[PDB]
Amino acid sequence: MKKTYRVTLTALGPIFIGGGEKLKKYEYIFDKQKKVAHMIDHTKFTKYLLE
RNA sequence: ACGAGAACAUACGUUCUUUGAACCAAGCUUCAACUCC
């Protein structure tokens, strides 16, 4: 009766979940030999391309 | 040359007073953002 636990997940392999977003080939992604992929925030980029 | 001739069943008067359409009641249940190239 009402046994509460604390499930601790330790990823052995890679864990990926959902998102609802498909970031395109050009949309906010930059990878080079320093091996990072910065994601640019969404509306600030186009409101900075406004000016 | 009528038991007749005259004579308003009329006057005054709130269908009114008191009163919760209330009470009890989860928009919830089961549900992988996933699948295949």
Side-chain angles (χ1 to χ4, degrees):
Chain A
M1 184 56 195
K2 207 54 164 293
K3 211 78 187 201
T4 311
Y5 300 86
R6 199 265 297 270
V7 176
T8 295
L9 208 61
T10 301
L12 172 81
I15 292 280
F16 170 74
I17 195 72
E21 288 265 318
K22 197 170 191 292
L23 270 287
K24 286 286 189 178
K25 63 179 288 185
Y26 81 107
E27 178 160 328
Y28 319 137
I29 299 171
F30 163 77
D31 54 339
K32 276 309 285 283
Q33 71 273 10
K34 46 189 66 55
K35 312 305 282 151
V36 291
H38 305 327
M39 282 73 74
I40 297 89
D41 73 357
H42 313 146
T43 182
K44 310 298 181 281
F45 178 65
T46 73
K47 86 196 268 174
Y48 182 76
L49 285 192
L50 181 64
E51 52 195 55

